[PDB]
Amino acid sequence: FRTQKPSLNTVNVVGSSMGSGGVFTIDGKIKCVTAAHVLTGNSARVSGVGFNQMLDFDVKGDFAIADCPNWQGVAPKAQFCEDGWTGRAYWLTSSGVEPGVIGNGFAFCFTACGDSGSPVITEAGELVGVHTGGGIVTRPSGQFCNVKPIKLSELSEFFAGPKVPLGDVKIGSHIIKDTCEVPSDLCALLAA
C-alpha cells in the first residue's frame, strides 16, 4: 500500500517528539501542517527536499499550522475539505502516500497512518486534517474523527470496478469481512 517515495511536499517535523507534516498553498499562503503535540511548545524543526528551518505554529487542539514563506518547493493548492465530505483519502507519510477512506464519523487507512502529523487529503486534493497516533484524524478546528475498522461491504462503496469474488486474498483485522464479493479495484488493492 505504501508509495515508494514520499510526496515532495511531505516534511519531517521534530520538536518534543518525532512527527511529519505537509506543505500546501492555502488561501494563497504556503502553510505547513502537522500535529501540535510533537512541537517544542509551538515550535519545530521542519525539513524536506530543499528546506530545513525552525517554524512557529498556530495551534487548534492537536492541529498545528505554520506560515512557511521560505518554502521554495512543491506546495500544491489545497483548501480545507467541506464539512460532511466523505470519500477516498490519502495519508502523506514519511514512507510514501497511503490510501484510505473518510466515512461519516470515522477514517480508515489501508496501512499504518504514518508519524503523527501526516496530512490526510481527499480525492479532490482538499485537506481533511492530520494524523495523530489505529489513531485519529484531527481537523483544522481541533475536532477529530477516530480511525476505526470498516465492513468490507462499506469499503466497497468507495471503489468502482465490476464486482469480483474476493477469492483467497487475505484481509487484515482492520476490515470486517461481511461479504466475499468486492469491486475489482478494491480486490486488486487488497491483493497488492
CATH number reported for the structural domain that contains residue 157 in this entry: 3.30.40.20
CATH number at 69 reads: 2.40.10.10
Asked whether residue 113 falls in the same domain as residue 162, the answer is: no
Asked whether residue 181 falls in the same domain as residue 162, the answer is: yes
DSSP for residue 33: E
Judged on CB neighbours under 10 Å (0-12, 13-18, 19+), 155 is buried
Residue that terminates a domain, selected from 78, 102, 123:
78
Instruction: Give me the domain span that covers residue 100.
Output: 79-147
Distance, in Å, from the CA atom of 174 to the CA atom of 55, rounded to the nearest integer, reads: 36
Domain count, the chain: 3
Strands 175-176, 150-151: pairing kind: parallel
SS (H, E, C) 38-102: HCECCEEEEEECCEEEEEECEEECCEEEEECCCCCCCCCECCECCCCCCEEEEEEECCEEEEEEE
Asked whether residue 12 falls in the same domain as residue 44, the answer is: yes
Asked whether residue 93 falls in the same domain as residue 66, the answer is: no
164 vs 113, 159, 187, CA distance in Å? 28, 12, 8
Residues in the chain: 192
Task: Establish if 165 belongs to a structural domain.
Answer: yes
Distance, in Å, from the CA atom of 34 to the CA atom of 37, rounded to the nearest integer, reads: 9
To one decimal, the resolution in angstroms is: 1.9
Strands 96-103, 106-109: pairing kind: antiparallel
Asked whether residue 134 falls in the same domain as residue 182, the answer is: no
8 vs 41, 47, 68, 111, 138, CA distance in Å? 27, 11, 15, 20, 22
The helix (H) or strand (E) run that includes residue 185 is helix 184-191
Q: What are phi and psi of 152, to 5 degrees?
A: -55, -40
Residue that terminates a domain, selected from 33, 54, 78:
78
Strands 29-35, 63-67: pairing kind: antiparallel
Distance, in Å, from the CA atom of 153 to the CA atom of 55, rounded to the nearest integer, reads: 43
112 CB-near residues (< 8 Å, 6+ apart): 93, 98, 134
3-class DSSP assignment, residue 144? strand
Radius of gyration for the alpha carbons in the chain, expressed in angstroms and rounded: 17
3-class DSSP assignment, residue 37? helix
Distance, in Å, from the CA atom of 107 to the CA atom of 181, rounded to the nearest integer, reads: 22
Residue that terminates a domain, selected from 58, 78, 98:
78
Asked whether residue 73 falls in the same domain as residue 40, the answer is: yes
3-class DSSP assignment, residue 190? helix
Amino acid (1-letter code) at residue 189: L
Asked whether residue 182 falls in the same domain as residue 154, the answer is: yes
The whole-angstrom distance between residue 51's C-alpha and the CA centroid of its chain comes to 21
> Most distant CA pair in the chain: distance in Å?
52
Cell matching residue 127: 485537506
11 vs 8, 75, 103, 151, CA distance in Å? 8, 11, 26, 33
Asked whether residue 42 falls in the same domain as residue 91, the answer is: no
